[PDB]
């Protein structure tokens, strides 16, 4: 309709994040998104997230972790919506065969975080709900936690919309044309111009970046979370359960504590069915996995809260060939921001990214180190047209 300094594609879990700080910085900024955020048709919903910091995936990630735990704390104290709770996560696997539970103590030794470590029985005194063999070991970070994501977003956009920040919404991006000095969107409700452009459009990144003319492999895939009537004696948030994130024989699950109430929630990490964003499945159970895979890891270990499925939700996460994200300019315009390829373990840091996404759009650089989220790495298969 006319013209803006930024215009954001995508106001989901990133996006969102770097219109808050584009408009805390006076930048006249537009955010446009297919739906209306928060909403059920991404990869932000679910209502928790757990944030960890003994990061082992990559160095780089633990400074941006820390930075994105401080920021949580800052939205927490600027909004009434809540945003985190100090649940703590607790992470294990066997001892000499886990690669995950390996390289978080060495994340932990590296960075002097602070953690608890114990093993085998250990594990099941502190807490009663949780049985694991006894060859088992653990690493507990009490100073992290879970955020509720879907207030997260809504707390970002009130917050930009009240600095001026302009959300357009059920408005889809259909194709981009790019200048060296501006930047112009095409969309069903009209066309709109601006000086930068940050590109945020999570799992649909996969079918729209050719339209920038990248040519880098990103495969959605349909991942399932389900809410389990526990017992609250043991598995509740109030009295100390934690958020935890394991690895075991058939692979990783992340849960999260009964909060209210609502009930123990899982996900199975390592598996999900390779999907199109726009033919999705978005119904809970229509494949026998849906609810076998979660069973499976609640009568073994959690046995207390192997009771009735009260809710499921259907969400998805975007791969990278590595699984590391990418967080860089576009190699051919440095106008355009790109930001994709969370691959599922991305929403702790959509804060500090904001941050990050806001400093390279206004100066074509940032003050965190993001070289390995680079769109030039080998790993990744990146190429053009
Ligand atoms: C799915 C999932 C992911 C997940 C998780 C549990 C589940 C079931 N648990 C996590 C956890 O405990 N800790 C963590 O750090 N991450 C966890 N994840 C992964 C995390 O949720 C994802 O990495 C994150 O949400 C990725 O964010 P991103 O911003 O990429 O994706 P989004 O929030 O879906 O936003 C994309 C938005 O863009 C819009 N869009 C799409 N196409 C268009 C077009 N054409 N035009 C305009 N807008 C568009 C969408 O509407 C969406 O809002
Ligand atoms: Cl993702």
Known sequence: STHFDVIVVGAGSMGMAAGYQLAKQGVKTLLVDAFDPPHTNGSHHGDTRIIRHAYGEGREYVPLALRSQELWYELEKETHHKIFTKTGVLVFGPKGESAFVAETMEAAKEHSLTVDLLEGDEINKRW????????????????????????????????????????????????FDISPDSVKIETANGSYTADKLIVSMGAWNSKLLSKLNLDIPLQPYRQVVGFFESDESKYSNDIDFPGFMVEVPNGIYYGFPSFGGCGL????????????????????GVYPEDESNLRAFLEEYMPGANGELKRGAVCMYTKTL????????????????????????????????????????????????????????????????
């Not at 899982?266 to 390779?274: I, R």
């Not at 990418?326 to 790109?338: A, F, G, K, R």
């Not at 691959?343 to 806001?358: A, D, I, P, T, Y």
Request: proline share 5%; glycine share 8%; aromatic share 10%.
């Open 322 to 385: 590595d699984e590391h994200f990418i967080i860089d300019l576009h190699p051919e315009h440095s106008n355009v921001v790109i930001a994709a390829g969370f691959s599922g373990h991305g929403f702790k840091f959509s804060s500090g990214v904001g941050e990050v996404l806001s400093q390279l759009a206004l100066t074509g650089k940032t003050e965190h180190d993001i070289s390995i989220f680079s769109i030039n790495r080998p790993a990744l298969k990146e190429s053009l047209q």
């Open 265 to 284: 929630k899982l996900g199975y990490h390592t598996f999900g069915q390779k999907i199109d964003p726009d033919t999705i499945n978005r119904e809970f």
């Open 128 to 175: 009663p709900g949780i049985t694991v063999p006894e060859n088992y070991n653990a690493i507990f970070e009490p100073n992290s936690g879970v955020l509720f994501s879907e207030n997260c977003i809504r707390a970002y956009r009130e917050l930009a919309e009240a600095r001026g920040a302009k959300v357009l919404t059920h408005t889809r991006v259909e194709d």
